[PDB]
């Protein structure tokens, strides 16, 4: 769920999910249109695609468990939906950590009309 996902992101990057990653570029958040603006936005795009691979799961509400093994994220064993949701989130959190260097505030609250072009998962 968004509860577990927010806490991972905070742990990983030290930024709060809302407002740092809830309205960033074209894909972090609500969004789903156009060309991702930068590496961080790409993390969100791949994360959206990841959720897209799960039809009959509910990523926003479905709760999974995970533990830290010296920093490493380890998804604990639940339903198959919970397992796969946790892996999508884990990949996003790390992707975020990897790209922190190029995170730009210029992309926060990015306007919809500038979210142009197309990209297939």
């Amino acid at each position: 769920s968004l509860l577990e996902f927010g806490k991972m992101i905070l742990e990983e990057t030290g930024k709060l999910a809302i407002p740092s990653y809830s309205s960033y570029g074209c894909y972090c958040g609500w969004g789903g249109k156009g060309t991702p603006k930068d590496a961080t936005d790409r993390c969100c795009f791949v994360h959206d695609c990841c959720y897209g691979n799960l039809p009959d799961c509910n990523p926003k509400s479905d709760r999974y468990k995970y533990k830290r093994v010296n920093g490493a994220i380890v998804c604990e064993k639940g339903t198959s939906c919970e397992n796969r949701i946790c892996e999508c989130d884990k990949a996003a959190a790390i992707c975020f950590r990897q790209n922190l260097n190029t995170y730009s505030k210029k992309y926060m609250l990015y306007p919809d009309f500038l979210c142009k072009g197309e990209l297939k998962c």
Partner: peptide
């Protein structure tokens, strides 16, 4: 909480 909700990154959507």
């Amino acid at each position: 909480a909700v990154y959507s």
